Design a binder for this molecule. Structure first.
Ligand SMILES: OC[C@H]1O[C@H](O)[C@H](O)[C@@H]1O
Ligand SMILES: OC[C@H]1O[C@H](O)[C@H](O)[C@@H]1O
Lengths: 268, 267
């Protein structure tokens, strides 16, 4: 059949849309078709569609969502010898292929940047019970930042960043690390409604470098993930297992970098 | 149970939300959704689209003009695989189709700029546009019957950005961006040139994607009911599946103006 199942958290976040293009770009060349499963549109309580999809007889699965459990994977895919690869919000056990990006180092770079701009009181805005990759950004951030950090939990979404703004306005913080660019966009909107300026009132740094970063005002300083390349590499490694099932388990980490734009400024 | 869905590209939030609408129906009925981003088949012969359209599925959703009627007739009709067309794929009589009112949308954008007192306006849009998009221009020009300039550019954020130098050379005051992505491009470019919205240019977009609420100023635009377009499309297809003799059904959905803060009366 030459079918690959792709399970992502959503397709509305430009991050996961570009992941899919990355994958599609590799699959097209080999006449594989992409079965799309974004978990957000499975509205059942116990992910009935996901559990039924993971049991289809496809040639391989890309798993980027933590909603597929290690137990499920063992009883369906390892038991049936259906190759798969994990990334992003799906944590690797270590007996599979996986492609990570360097979340820990990204958090370090974000911290280093706010320190270079002399911010001493900062907020990190992130979801509760965060996926491990996301948690690593906070961990990397706190590995090098030794001044006052406050955590605000909010939904991993534009509405989430928006709904965090009232709490931020009650604090003494001057710099904000938004754990993804969508949160940062939410911040922008909420801060604008409050008549607060960026970066004059708040310095903000995002994460991902989605295309919209250059179209918001001011352009958003962020940590770039190589998402197109993550999608290409992920598909490439999966098709390699499909063609030689017994190859060794491979786990690569792709690098990240700071993209400085106009959304931070030195504390004056 | 499989449905092939052919869209121009999923990186446009419009198409992401369409797919979400489709999925709200398909997932509950346990269908598999095969995605094809038509944009990414850059082969001379569109060999991937041919490969895909020849697959044995239960049905196709076709929102791309890159699948010709000939290809459909010879492949889908001849094999009795049901399908439905929408958006950039023009409907004929002998197929199901869900439209949105592109002509009226264009008229609504024009009426808004007219109410906002703009006399010299520009429309920013792609060359050889899909028919549904072309209709927006037709609608808009039904109202602005003179003093409309057309700037042709790619249907994307970078396209809108690229168009700003040409805009700056005109005396226009109001701009209709044929989609929100082009409008976001205009924002970036006009910021770079030191121009303000709406103080120097009033801008109206098209689609009402999520991001309209998060740009500065929030973008006035023509909303397409895109989730519901997704739902209705998937419903009509499954209806044809369980009743293949069904008369063809061709249902145009409504649009409307969402007024935010990217236009102002010309002073
Ligand atoms: O922006 C979406 C986030 O959730 C995912 O885990 C990605 O890494 C990305 O940062
Ligand atoms: O926004 C992408 C555009 O191309 C498509 O034709 C849609 O209708 C939308 O307006």
């Amino acid at each position: 059949s030459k079918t690959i199942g792709v399970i992502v958290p959503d397709i509305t976040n430009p991050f996961f849309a570009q992941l899919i293009r990355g994958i599609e770009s590799v699959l097209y060349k080999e006449n594989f078709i992409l079965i799309l499963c974004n978990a957000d549109q499975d509205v059942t309580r116990e992910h009935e569609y996901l559990t039924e999809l993971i049991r289809r007889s496809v040639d391989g699965f890309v798993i980027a969502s933590s909603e597929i459990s290690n137990q499920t994977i063992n009883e369906t895919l390892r038991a049936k010898k259906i190759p798969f690869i994990v990334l992003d919000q799906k944590k690797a056990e270590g007996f599979s292929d996986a492609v990570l990006t360097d979340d820990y180092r990204g958090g370090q770079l974000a911290a280093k940047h706010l320190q270079e701009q002399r911010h001493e009181q900062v907020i990190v805005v992130m979801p509760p019970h965060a996926p491990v990759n996301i948690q690593q950004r906070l961990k990397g951030f706190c590995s090098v930042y030794t001044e006052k950090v406050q955590l605000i939990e909010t939904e991993l979404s534009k509405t989430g960043g928006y709904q965090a703004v009232p709490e931020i306005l009650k604090t003494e913080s001057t710099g904000i690390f938004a754990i993804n660019d969508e949160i940062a966009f939410g911040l922008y909107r909420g801060l604008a409604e409050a008549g607060k300026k960026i970066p004059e009132d708040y310095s903000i740094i995002g994460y991902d470098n989605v295309d919209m970063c250059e179209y918001v005002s001011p352009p958003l300083t962020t940590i770039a993930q190589p998402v197109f390349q993550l999608g290409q590499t992920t598909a490439t490694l999966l098709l390699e297992r499909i063609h030689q099932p017994a190859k060794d388990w491979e786990e690569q980490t792709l690098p990240v970098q700071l993209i400085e734009r106009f959304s931070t400024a030195p504390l004056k």
